[PDB]
Amino acid sequence: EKNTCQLYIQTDHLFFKYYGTREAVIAQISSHVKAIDTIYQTTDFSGIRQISFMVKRIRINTTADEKDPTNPFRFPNIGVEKFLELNSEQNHDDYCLAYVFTDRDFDDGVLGLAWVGAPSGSSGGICEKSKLYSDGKKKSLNTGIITVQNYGSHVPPKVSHITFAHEVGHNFGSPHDSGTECTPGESKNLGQKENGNYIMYARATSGDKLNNNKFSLCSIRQISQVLEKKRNNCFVESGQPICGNGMVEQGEECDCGYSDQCKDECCFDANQPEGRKCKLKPGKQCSPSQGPCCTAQCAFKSKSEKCRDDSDCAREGICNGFTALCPASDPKPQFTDCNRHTQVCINGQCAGSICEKYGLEECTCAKELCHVCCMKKMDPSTCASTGSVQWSRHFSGRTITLQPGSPCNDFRGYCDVFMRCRLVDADGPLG
Ligand SMILES: *[C@@H]1O[C@H](CO)[C@@H](O[C@@H]2O[C@H](CO)[C@@H](O[C@H]3O[C@H](CO)[C@@H](O)[C@H](O[C@H]4O[C@H](CO)[C@@H](O)[C@H](O[C@H]5O[C@H](CO)[C@@H](O)[C@H](O)[C@@H]5O)[C@@H]4O)[C@@H]3O)[C@H](O)[C@H]2NC(C)=O)[C@H](O)[C@H]1NC(C)=O
Numbered sequence: 001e002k003n004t005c006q007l008y009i010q011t012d013h014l015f016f017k018y019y020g021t022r023e024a025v026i027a028q029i030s031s032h033v034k035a036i037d038t039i040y041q042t043t044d045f046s047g048i049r050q051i052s053f054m055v056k057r058i059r060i061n062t063t064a065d066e067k068d069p070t071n072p073f074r075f076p077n078i079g080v081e082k083f084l085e086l087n088s089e090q091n092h093d094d095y096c097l098a099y100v101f102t103d104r105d106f107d108d109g110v111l112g113l114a115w116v117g118a119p120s121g122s123s124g125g126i127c128e129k130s131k132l133y134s135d136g137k138k139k140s141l142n143t144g145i146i147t148v149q150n151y152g153s154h155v156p157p158k159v160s161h162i163t164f165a166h167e168v169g170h171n172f173g174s175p176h177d178s179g180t181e182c183t184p185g186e187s188k189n190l191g192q193k194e195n196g197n198y199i200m201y202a203r204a205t206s207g208d209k210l211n212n213n214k215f216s217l218c219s220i221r222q223i224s225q226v227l228e229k230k231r232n233n234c235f236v237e238s239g240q241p242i243c244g245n246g247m248v249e250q251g252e253e254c255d256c257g258y259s260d261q262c263k264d265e266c267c268f269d270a271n272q273p274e275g276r277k278c279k280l281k282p283g284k285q286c287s288p289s290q291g292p293c294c295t296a297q298c299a300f301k302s303k304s305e306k307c308r309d310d311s312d313c314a315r316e317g318i319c320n321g322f323t324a325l326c327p328a329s330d331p332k333p334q335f336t337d338c339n340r341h342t343q344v345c346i347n348g349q350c351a352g353s354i355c356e357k358y359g360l361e362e363c364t365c366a367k368e369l370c371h372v373c374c375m376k377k378m379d380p381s382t383c384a385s386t387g388s389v390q391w392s393r394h395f396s397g398r399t400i401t402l403q404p405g406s407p408c409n410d411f412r413g414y415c416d417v418f419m420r421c422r423l424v425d426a427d428g429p430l431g
């Protein structure tokens with residue numbers, strides 16, 4: 001019944017700076033929610049199935065907001081703890097959860113931060129209200145943050161989506177996975193190690209393995225308790241998409257937002273009467289909310305306009321001149337070198353490693369931890385470097401080094417700009 005959680009997604013100017021336009025970031029937050037939507041719906045939470053998410057409102061900040069003296073997110077150097085405290089200092093009683101997306105390089109390889117939920121005896125996590133806390137601030141602890149930059153390198157959407165579900169996992173009351181039964185990556189068995197760790201793994205994840213996409217036995221039990229005790233206070237029943245969330249969905253022609261948010265002269269905002277709200281205004285044939293192939297003056301862009309830039313294995317996206325959406329770009333040949341000759345292309349996305357290009361698998365070298373050591377599949381004894389004589393027929397003695405922000409040493413840390421595998425664990429006292 002009450003199985004869907006209404007979200008509120010914000011993006012600062014650094015996130016807008018990376019992607020360029022408001023359409024591109026909206027497509028990012030749409031892709032991120034649809035990612036965690038499929039992960040949670042296909043998870044059996046002790047009998048509670050088909051638990052989903054939905055965006056109730058967005059707030060896309062541009063570089064123009066960086067000069068706002070009342071915007072506390074404008075400072076370039078903001079600590080990850082204070083970044084989440086800024087998100088918490090807002091009233092989010094109208095949303096089950098509230099997230100803010102950024103493109104900051106947090107210290108110690110931190111890719112996100114969120115409050116941990118609990119069935120009782122502890123504040124935070126999913127579905128908290130705005131109340132006075134110990135520090136004297138009226139915070140809403142139903143909040144979390146995510147960043148798409150780590151060690152001066154952007155993280156792919158495959159790892160970004162999992163990180164989004166990781167922090168939401170804490171909001172659902174799941175701690176980090178512990179023990180061999182819930183972290184197969186550190187197991188002494190080749191069968192369980194190939195499947196990788198789970199979503200709530202406390203360290204680095206690649207997203208190219210089986211278990212990295214779904215929760216563990218440890219996490220499902222912990223989340224099922226928070227869902228049994230907390231979701232009923234805030235979740236809503238599955239219904240039609242709401243008008244005014246800034247994303248065009250099924251049943252609406254356009255979607256700019258509400259009155260204090262719609263700057264689109266071609267779309268009725270959500271404050272208009274039923275029958276015309278989220279419906280295309282007369283004389284207008286599209287709205288920028290539908291896609292990038294629509295100008296601000298609400299005309300279809302020409303068949304020569306470039307909508308999506310050329311990626312590592314995703315060709316240019318050219319408009320068709322008849323719809324506001326952009327056609328899906330055709331992918332490049334598979335096993336093509338991407339990410340500076342470090343990874344190959346798997347189904348149109350830069351994933352895996354360069355070892356797969358020649359029928360090999362990634363291995364941990366014997367500081368050479370940020371070098372790529374390949375191995376024959378199922379045989380760990382053949383693990384040699386790319387610049388070795390074994391694979392001299394494929395790599396020809398060249399030594400491929402891992403880019404900054406890549407997993408290293410059996411997913412225990414990340415590589416930095418000085419080619420060092422720095423570990424991620426951080427411990428602090430409890431009150
Ligand atoms: C994206 O850009 C937009 C627009 O540029 C940003 O939106 C702005 O966000 C800021 C903060 O989130 C807003 O700043 C004021 O918001 C309220 C509007 O009146 C103010 O009340 C608020 O005052 C706060 O200041 C202190 C913060 O520590 C605090 O002492 C104040 O006290 C109040 O609350 C305490 C409990 O904490 C209570 O005990 C007191 O009695 C009192 O009620 C209060 O907390 C902010 O000064 C700003 O209005 C808003 N809009 C703008 C600038 O147009 C958005 O943040 C950006 N987001 C990102 C991710 O970049």
Ligand SMILES: [Ca+2]
Nearest residue numbers: 242243247255
């Ligand atoms: Ca909508």
Ligand SMILES: [Zn+2]
Nearest residue numbers: 166170176202
């Ligand atoms: Zn975590």
